[PDB]
């Protein structure tokens, strides 16, 4: 299979290198016959002789046009004739493209900013990560000596850890009594030892967590300081560093540097992206953090080195575990888009669609529009109206069905042929008009994007049915990832339409999709109300919650299935409404805030879940008790009494102080925490003396931080906690947000 492609220069000529892994053997294929090129639209074919003679200069070397050929391609639906201009080297393109554009007889130029190695994969029809070849993976992490007022990598690397199927090991230059620790004499020997491990293991994938902006940069400065040839590449090369905007990225030639940090940054949404928080959210298992101060203190005193070595080991271990969880999904995404895993894993949603479209455009002989210039880019700060959100009929409801459209936005694009090449196209005999915005779309021929989107949805169905018949559980997982990734890519076409940097950007297309979406969701709602007598409790963009308040659970289900048969016969094209699920009870607080419970007793909450550690146990316990009384018992007046009971126990000081302790970690220098937080205030009082902050809020005057004390110093016989604080700032805010819709103000409890 193909891992990646790049180019080297030989006698001023580009040579493509294709890195492959066939039958467990690494191979490099060379191609010296791929010519870089750009298109040029001319107003007169006679002008081609003037364009051929246009010259530029890179660094003394004269840039010339190698050869030209007239080709017929499609552009905005219409057939067009452009000149394919070939060059000697891909770096000739940025040097001469401006001189060719400025020529009077040149209307415009196209496909002039496509990286050579990526242009090769598309033009040759090559797809990376294709097949069932097994890649060998290796994760690694480093521990460093940090001091407050020092430059980057001024301190040495203390430990280098690595992990794979054989387990996790730590290389260090100090004696540590642990079975997984390998001891060397110096930092130089530790680095050299790590090089030998990578060379002997010969992994296809190197997995890091933030290796793009820390690990490789630290290793580089250290190898320069110690005189070590950091040959990580399979061709004997040192890691290549690139600039990605305001940040960096690192390639390792012959292998795939898989940095988990940008991948997880897009996949899940978390408050922080530390390795500890990420691992705990994905695997649900805790991971202890050992700070730079503790590491430095342990290394200088030689005391708790086992704790440091164990932290180092866990870093490599969890990085390998996370890499095993996210890499197969990103590998299938790379195969789908048609680009290397290195680029795909570092590209955002907008670029992924663009690369997919660029490959398809070449296959369909479709000339790709250019990126917007700075002037046009500033003009594309255009916003528009989004999805429809119904104001919910607040309160507790019984026997609720959730109905939603199968791929609403892609269905609209296909059905109404929404595309920049069909937008206001004159000369057609059939059009579809978008409500409110009024944009017209030609229906005479399939548009470029709707046509590809139709093939994607069709391809996904071919994968779904092959999964049912696939005996092999590993192959079923592979197909499952591809199927899921097609759904993700198909649902990204809409956002791409409103993406200002997009080649196929079209605000008219984007707002037409949302306008049609608002129409279909609203028409379906009034249809179920008027012709089936349902009450629509709440709706958001592509689905709604409905019920018959005076009907049986089986009666609601039956009527819902009958409604589905009815509207699906009336919906045009690919639009389709589906039965998502049935819920025994449901509480709808405000727009975007609600909670439902199924027949199994599983509760789904969207809004103020409050599963955080920076909130007292008393507040979290009461909230759970309230939700249970509402969703399991359907007793609203019981949920109220529970809050009244808790506030009465808090006011009479009958609640144990252990369920009032708040735990908060110090992650930065005390001078940098100028938020006057209670945990920081407690920490500053500790630092004021000679020598996770666990504190309780006591009864007194001043700010919360002025009252707060560590729980170790709290004594029920000498001190009194702030009953008012735990009622008004902890319990009531957490519960009021749920009971709010009933009209139960804070003073009602
Ligand atoms: Ca590449
Ligand atoms: Ca659905
Ligand atoms: Ca088709
Ligand atoms: Ca239909």
């Amino acid at each position: 299979m193909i891992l990646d492609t790049d180019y080297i220069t030989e006698d001023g000529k580009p040579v493509i290198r294709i890195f492959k892994k066939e039958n467990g053997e690494f191979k490099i294929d060379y191609d010296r016959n791929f010519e870089p090129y750009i298109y040029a639209l001319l107003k007169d074919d006679s002008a081609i002789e003037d364009v051929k003679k246009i010259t530029a200069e890179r660094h003394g070397t004269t840039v010339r046009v190698v050869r030209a050929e007239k080709v017929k391609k499609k552009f905005l639906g219409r057939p067009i004739e452009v000149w394919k201009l070939y060059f000697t080297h891909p770096q000739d393109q940025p040097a001469i493209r401006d001189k060719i554009k400025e020529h009077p007889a040149v209307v415009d130029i196209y496909e002039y900013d496509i990286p050579f190695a990526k242009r090769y994969l598309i033009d040759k029809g090559l797809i990376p990560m294709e097949g069932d070849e097994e890649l060998k993976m290796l994760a690694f992490a480093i521990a460093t000596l940090y001091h407050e007022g020092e430059e980057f990598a001024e301190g040495p690397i203390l430990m280098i850890s690595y992990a794979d199927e054989e387990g996790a090991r730590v290389i260090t230059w100090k004696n540590i009594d642990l079975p997984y620790v390998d001891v060397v004499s110096t930092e130089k020997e530790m680095i050299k030892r790590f090089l030998k491990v990578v060379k002997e293991k010969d992994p296809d994938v190197l997995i890091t967590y933030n290796g793009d902006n820390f690990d490789f940069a630290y290793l580089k400065k250290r190898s320069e300081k110690l005189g070590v040839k950091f040959i990580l590449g399979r061709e004997g090369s040192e890691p290549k560093i690139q600039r990605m905007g305001d940040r960096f990225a690192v390639e390792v030639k012959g292998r795939i540097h898989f940095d988990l940090y940008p991948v997880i940054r897009r996949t899940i949404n978390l408050p922080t992206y530390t390795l500890e928080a990420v691992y705990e959210a994905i695997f649900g298992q805790p991971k202890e953090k050992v700070y730079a101060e503790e590491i430095a203190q342990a290394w200088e005193t030689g005391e708790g080195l086992e704790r440091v070595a164990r932290y180092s080991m866990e870093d490599a271990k969890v990085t390998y575990e996370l890499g095993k969880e996210f890499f197969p999904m990103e590998a299938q995404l790379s195969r789908l888009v048609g680009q290397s895993l290195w680029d795909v894993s570092r590209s955002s949603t907008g670029n992924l669609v663009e690369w997919f479209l660029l490959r398809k455009a070449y296959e369909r002989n479709e000339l790709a529009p250019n990126k917007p210039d700075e002037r046009e880019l500033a003009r594309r700060r255009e916003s528009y109206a989004g999805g429809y959100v119904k104001e919910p009929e607040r309160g507790l409801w019984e026997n609720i069905v959730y109905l939603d459209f199968r791929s609403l936005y892609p269905s609209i694009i296909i059905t109404h042929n929404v595309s920049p090449d069909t937008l206001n196209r004159e000369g057609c005999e059939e059009y579809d008009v978008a409500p409110q915005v009024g944009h017209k779309f030609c229906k005479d021929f399939p548009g470029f994007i709707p046509s590809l989107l139709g093939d994607l949805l069709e391809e996904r169905q071919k994968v779904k049915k092959k999964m049912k018949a696939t005996i092999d559980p590993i192959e079923k997982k592979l197909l499952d990832y591809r199927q899921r990734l097609i759904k993700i890519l198909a649902n990204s076409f809409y956002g791409y339409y409103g993406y200002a940097k997009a080649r196929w950007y079209c605000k008219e297309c984007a707002e037409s999709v949302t306008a049609w979406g608002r129409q279909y969701i609203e028409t379906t709602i009034r249809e179920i109300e008027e012709k089936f007598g349902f009450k629509v409790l709440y709706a958001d963009t592509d689905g709604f919650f409905a019920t018959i308040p005076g009907a049986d659970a089986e009666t609601v289900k039956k009527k819902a299935k009958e409604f589905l048969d009815y509207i699906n016969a009336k919906l045009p094209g690919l639009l389709e409404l589906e039965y998502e699920g049935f819920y025994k009870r449901g509480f709808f607080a405000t727009k975007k805030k609600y909670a439902v419970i199924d027949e199994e007793d599983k509760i789904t909450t969207r809004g103020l879940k409050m599963v955080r550690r920076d909130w007292s146990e008393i507040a979290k316990e009461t909230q759970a008790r309230v939700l249970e009384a509402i969703l399991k018992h359907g007793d609203v007046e019981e949920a109220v009494r529970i809050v009244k009971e808790v506030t009465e126990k808090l006011s009479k000081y009958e609640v144990p102080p252990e369920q009032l302790v708040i735990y908060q970690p110090i992650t930065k220098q005390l001078h940098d925490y100028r938020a006057r937080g209670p945990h920081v205030s407690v920490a500053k009082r500790l630092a004021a003396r000679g020598i996770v902050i666990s504190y309780i809020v006591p009864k007194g005057s001043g700010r919360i931080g002025d009252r707060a004390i560590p729980f170790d110093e709290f004594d029920p016989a000498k001190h009194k906690y702030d009953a008012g604080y735990y009622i008004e700032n902890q319990v009531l805010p957490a519960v009021e947000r749920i009971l709010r819709a009933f009209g139960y103000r804070k003073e009602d409890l």
Side-chain angles (χ1 to χ4, degrees):
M1 80 174 193
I2 298 173
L3 309 178
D4 203 345
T5 60
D6 81 332
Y7 81 96
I8 57 174
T9 306
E10 164 173 324
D11 298 309
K13 290 188 164 190
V15 179
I16 284 290
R17 295 193 295 182
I18 308 105
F19 301 97
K20 312 193 302 175
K21 231 294 191 76
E22 297 183 339
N23 313 333
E25 176 184 9
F26 173 73
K27 291 174 182 176
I28 303 179
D29 275 347
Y30 301 91
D31 200 340
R32 311 168 203 273
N33 287 88
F34 193 67
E35 301 161 303
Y37 66 89
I38 291 170
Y39 299 101
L41 178 65
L42 306 188
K43 54 185 62 180
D44 201 327
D45 277 4
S46 67
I48 198 58
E49 302 300 322
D50 303 309
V51 187
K52 284 186 178 70
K53 305 169 185 174
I54 297 180
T55 58
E57 282 171 79
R58 278 151 60 197
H59 297 273
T61 296
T62 74
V63 179
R64 217 163 287 192
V65 180
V66 154
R67 66 190 184 91
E69 68 164 309
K70 185 172 67 180
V71 295
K72 301 136 189 293
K73 312 182 71 60
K74 293 174 294 163
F75 189 72
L76 304 178
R78 308 285 182 179
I80 217 77
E81 266 203 341
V82 297
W83 285 91
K84 188 172 180 181
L85 316 181
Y86 293 89
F87 294 101
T88 305
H89 197 277
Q91 297 178 17
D92 292 335
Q93 305 170 323
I96 204 182
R97 67 194 180 197
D98 296 328
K99 252 61 155 61
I100 298 180
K101 173 182 72 174
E102 295 173 33
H103 185 261
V106 178
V107 180
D108 210 334
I109 59 169
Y110 301 94
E111 304 186 23
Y112 53 79
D113 52 6
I114 312 296
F116 197 61
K118 295 169 166 301
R119 168 54 74 198
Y120 185 82
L121 287 169
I122 293 174
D123 291 26
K124 296 293 184 178
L126 298 180
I127 291 130
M129 313 299 288
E130 205 176 26
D132 48 32
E133 261 294 294
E134 179 181 306
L135 296 181
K136 188 165 185 178
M137 304 183 264
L138 180 71
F140 77 83
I142 65 175
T144 67
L145 192 63
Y146 178 82
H147 283 98
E148 197 178 14
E150 291 188 346
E151 302 179 18
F152 181 77
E154 185 164 350
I157 304 178
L158 276 28
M159 298 175 187
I160 302 177
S161 60
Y162 61 90
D164 63 5
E165 289 304 317
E166 307 187 45
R169 298 201 67 87
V170 179
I171 314 170
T172 188
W173 45 285
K174 269 193 185 303
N175 185 32
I176 293 166
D177 194 21
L178 291 174
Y180 52 87
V181 172
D182 288 319
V183 179
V184 297
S185 61
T186 65
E187 179 194 13
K188 318 155 194 272
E189 221 57 58
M190 174 189 62
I191 301 170
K192 287 171 63 182
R193 180 63 209 261
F194 177 67
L195 264 309
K196 294 181 291 179
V197 167
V198 177
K199 186 159 197 175
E200 290 193 15
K201 286 181 175 296
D202 196 18
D204 301 289
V205 181
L206 283 178
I207 314 171
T208 69
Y209 194 81
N210 196 37
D212 276 347
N213 296 274
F214 185 81
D215 307 42
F216 280 110
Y218 210 104
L219 260 303
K220 180 189 180 185
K221 256 185 174 61
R222 273 292 145 176
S223 303
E224 292 167 346
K225 212 72 58 53
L226 303 172
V228 185
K229 298 136 288 184
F230 201 56
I231 294 166
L232 273 192
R234 273 176 162 154
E235 62 192 48
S237 67
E238 287 186 322
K240 185 174 63 175
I241 312 97
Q242 277 166 196
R243 183 90 63 161
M244 276 194 175
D246 55 325
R247 309 171 75 95
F248 294 100
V250 178
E251 302 191 40
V252 179
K253 252 57 176 154
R255 294 179 176 86
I256 302 173
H257 170 215
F258 189 69
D259 189 344
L260 282 162
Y261 185 69
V263 174
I264 303 167
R265 201 69 164 82
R266 302 144 37 197
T267 307
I268 65 179
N269 202 348
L270 300 178
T272 67
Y273 291 94
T274 67
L275 184 60
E276 288 72 26
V278 166
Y279 172 78
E280 195 163 332
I282 286 137
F283 295 95
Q285 213 259 324
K287 184 187 186 297
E288 191 182 60
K289 171 68 180 177
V290 176
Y291 302 92
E293 298 174 44
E294 291 173 310
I295 293 179
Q297 278 189 33
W299 188 268
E300 295 176 337
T301 67
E303 275 178 330
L305 286 178
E306 272 90 330
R307 183 166 175 264
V308 178
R310 187 168 66 248
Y311 167 79
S312 175
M313 182 268 295
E314 292 180 11
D315 268 12
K317 183 188 281 183
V318 308
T319 302
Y320 183 74
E321 294 298 333
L322 286 159
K324 223 156 73 174
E325 189 66 31
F326 290 92
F327 151 82
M329 181 81 165
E330 291 290 309
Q332 289 305 310
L333 181 61
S334 301
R335 173 193 160 198
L336 178 61
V337 172
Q339 296 300 321
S340 74
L341 176 61
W342 192 95
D343 296 292
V344 165
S345 69
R346 294 167 172 82
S347 301
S348 189
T349 302
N351 254 328
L352 298 179
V353 169
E354 190 134 296
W355 287 109
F356 179 82
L357 292 186
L358 280 168
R359 174 175 295 269
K360 293 298 179 185
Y362 181 86
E363 296 175 1
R364 291 164 137 259
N365 198 20
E366 195 76 44
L367 184 62
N370 301 319
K371 256 79 158 300
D373 52 50
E374 185 50 55
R375 281 177 174 177
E376 172 64 24
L377 196 58
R379 212 180 317 178
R380 292 179 176 184
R381 277 297 295 113
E382 307 175 305
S383 181
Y384 57 93
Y388 166 77
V389 182
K390 187 176 194 295
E391 169 61 32
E393 291 203 13
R394 307 179 168 194
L396 187 71
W397 299 99
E398 210 93 37
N399 302 325
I400 310 169
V401 51
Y402 185 66
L403 305 173
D404 69 333
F405 285 95
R406 172 174 197 83
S407 311
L408 178 65
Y409 287 1
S411 289
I412 292 172
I413 297 173
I414 296 169
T415 304
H416 301 297
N417 208 31
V418 184
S419 193
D421 59 335
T422 62
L423 176 67
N424 300 321
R425 180 193 170 114
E426 49 194 1
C428 300
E429 284 122 312
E430 186 177 356
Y431 295 95
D432 279 359
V433 183
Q436 303 177 269
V437 290
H439 303 302
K440 309 189 68 176
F441 298 94
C442 179
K443 306 296 300 294
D444 293 19
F445 70 100
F448 175 65
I449 287 176
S451 181
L452 295 176
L453 185 42
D455 295 347
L456 277 175
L457 267 51
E458 182 159 34
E459 161 79 355
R460 180 165 177 260
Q461 297 307 315
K462 309 171 194 308
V463 170
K464 297 254 253 176
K465 67 173 60 182
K466 191 183 177 173
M467 277 180 66
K468 315 288 178 51
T470 303
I471 170 70
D472 182 24
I474 279 78
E475 184 186 357
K476 256 199 74 173
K477 271 297 115 192
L478 194 114
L479 299 174
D480 190 28
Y481 289 145
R482 176 174 182 85
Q483 174 268 141
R484 283 165 58 192
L485 288 153
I486 293 171
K487 180 189 63 64
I488 295 177
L489 173 62
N491 290 314
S492 305
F493 278 129
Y494 157 68
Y496 175 83
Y497 269 151
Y499 175 43
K501 312 184 182 179
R503 289 175 182 265
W504 280 275
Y505 165 90
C506 197
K507 182 204 175 170
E508 299 91 343
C509 284
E511 67 185 2
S512 290
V513 172
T514 65
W516 254 305
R518 289 192 303 271
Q519 182 188 80
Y520 288 119
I521 194 57
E522 283 175 317
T523 46
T524 300
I525 288 168
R526 304 173 161 272
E527 208 73 29
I528 201 177
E529 291 171 338
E530 295 173 9
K531 299 191 178 177
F532 286 88
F534 274 80
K535 170 184 287 300
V536 172
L537 303 162
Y538 176 63
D540 192 349
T541 305
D542 63 352
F544 61 85
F545 295 91
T547 191
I548 311 176
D552 202 327
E554 189 49 57
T555 302
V556 169
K557 292 174 189 175
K558 182 195 67 178
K559 296 297 181 63
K561 298 178 232 74
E562 294 176 354
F563 171 70
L564 286 170
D565 281 339
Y566 167 77
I567 36 82
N568 283 321
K570 287 200 164 184
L571 289 172
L574 289 192
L575 279 102
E576 179 92 5
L577 196 68
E578 296 182 333
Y579 190 90
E580 189 272 344
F582 177 82
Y583 303 93
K584 275 182 172 175
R585 280 186 199 89
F587 185 84
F588 298 86
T590 67
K591 290 178 170 184
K592 307 288 193 188
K593 296 183 188 303
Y594 69 90
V596 290
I597 179 175
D598 60 30
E599 289 156 311
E600 325 282 343
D601 283 348
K602 175 184 174 186
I603 298 167
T604 307
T605 301
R606 180 148 184 258
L608 255 299
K609 309 168 192 183
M610 273 199 58
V611 288
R612 285 85 62 97
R613 65 165 169 269
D614 54 355
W615 292 90
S616 65
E617 186 62 26
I618 192 59
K620 294 152 64 177
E621 175 178 344
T622 312
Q623 189 187 8
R625 286 175 63 187
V626 160
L627 281 179
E628 185 176 26
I630 297 173
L631 294 159
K632 190 177 184 301
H633 299 282
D635 200 330
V636 50
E637 57 182 359
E638 177 181 311
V640 174
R641 289 190 304 267
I642 290 171
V643 186
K644 291 184 177 178
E645 165 198 310
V646 171
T647 56
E648 184 175 335
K649 286 194 65 181
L650 277 177
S651 69
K652 294 189 298 187
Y653 296 92
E654 301 179 347
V655 174
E658 300 86 37
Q659 304 201 359
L660 301 175
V661 192
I662 308 161
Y663 314 100
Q664 214 158 353
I666 296 292
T667 65
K668 333 153 188 176
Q669 295 153 3
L670 297 192
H671 44 267
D672 299 336
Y673 262 123
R674 288 174 185 169
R676 292 184 179 271
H679 82 120
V680 177
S681 303
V682 176
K684 287 180 183 177
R685 296 185 186 101
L686 264 50
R689 314 177 303 178
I691 308 111
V692 173
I693 306 294
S694 313
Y695 68 97
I696 187 175
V697 177
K699 191 171 207 70
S701 63
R703 307 165 311 206
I704 306 169
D706 289 322
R707 313 200 299 269
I709 62 161
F711 184 66
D712 291 338
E713 308 175 6
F714 184 84
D715 193 38
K718 302 182 174 296
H719 311 126
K720 267 182 180 62
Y721 57 79
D722 201 342
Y725 170 83
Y726 289 98
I727 289 172
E728 304 289 337
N729 300 34
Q730 291 278 319
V731 172
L732 260 46
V735 183
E736 156 262 330
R737 289 189 279 269
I738 299 167
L739 303 180
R740 191 215 318 273
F742 300 118
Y744 287 134
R745 320 151 175 92
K746 287 185 173 181
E747 60 266 40
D748 283 281
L749 8 128

